[PDB]
């Protein structure tokens, strides 16, 4: 998160910290959010050989009783995810066991409505990602308020698609999701509407988020069958 604030500790109890393991490199990290006691939603590009989820975290360097470190049994990457275009950048993680409900850990279920979100309004995104181009991931959960932009603002991303994705962040501000914030939720009036997907290496906003509304049928299908 660039140009944001430190979250009030445990104020976003659905937030998930993902450690992603691959065979031929060190750990990578993503965000995500708990939508059921045993399901986390994140980005498809956060897939790996194995993943561990930590719920209940604020400062991810300091172990505390709120932590729940949870095993992932299965990854459900969107079947049409494309590594070239980055279309359909969404994935569900099934946890081995159901998480405990505490003050610090809870679900963020979707409302019944899945209305298309138009440009204009302010939304908020959170994560443990880099706080600048040359800075490292944040030890503490950070968050920032960003503007939903008209789709033409993301035209320079040649594979951007308004039906599939949100265009997020006023180009006149530094404020942005960035590297390390992958998979984290964009909340608009308390409702998850986007997932951090990709942007520019130089951090100039806007960035591209998965439009959750488009994938509500697919999400429902996985949750009902597993
Ligand atoms: C768990 O594996 C990773 O994290 N891999 C690295 C990786 C990242 C990142 O470092 O998070 N992002 C988000 C991203 C990359 C650049 C500028 C951005 C600008 C804004 C927002 C996100 C941005 C990706 C997107 C697509 C992709 F195939 C790989 C990545
Ligand atoms: Zn605490």
From Swiss-Prot:
One GO CC annotation: extracellular region
Residue numbers annotated as active site: 45, 89, 182
Pfam families to which the protein is assigned, alphabetical: Trypsin (PF00089)
Annotated keywords: Disulfide bond, Glycoprotein, Hydrolase, Protease, Secreted, Serine protease, Signal, Zymogen
Record has rRNA-binding as a keyword: no
Principal EC category: hydrolase
Molecular-function GO term, any one: serine-type peptidase activity
Reaction catalysis annotation: Preferential cleavage: Phe-|-Xaa > Tyr-|-Xaa > Trp-|-Xaa > Leu-|-Xaa
GO biological process: angiotensin maturation; basement membrane disassembly; cellular response to glucose stimulus; cytokine precursor processing; extracellular matrix disassembly; midbrain development; peptide metabolic process; positive regulation of angiogenesis
Tissue spec. comment: Mast cells in lung, heart, skin and placenta. Expressed in both normal skin and in urticaria pigmentosa lesions.
Gene3D superfamilies: Trypsin-like serine proteases
Domain Peptidase S1 positions: 1-224
Cellular compartment(s): Secreted; Cytoplasmic granule
Disulfide-bonded cysteines: 30-46, 123-188, 154-167
Hydrolase recorded as keyword: yes
Glycosylation sites: 59, 82
Enzyme Commission code(s) on record: 3.4.21.39
Physiological role: Major secreted protease of mast cells with suspected roles in vasoactive peptide generation, extracellular matrix degradation, and regulation of gland secretion.
Family: Belongs to the peptidase S1 family. Granzyme subfamily.
Entry protein name: Chymase
Origin species: Homo sapiens (Human)
Lineage, highest ranks first: Eukaryota, Metazoa, Chordata, Craniata, Vertebrata
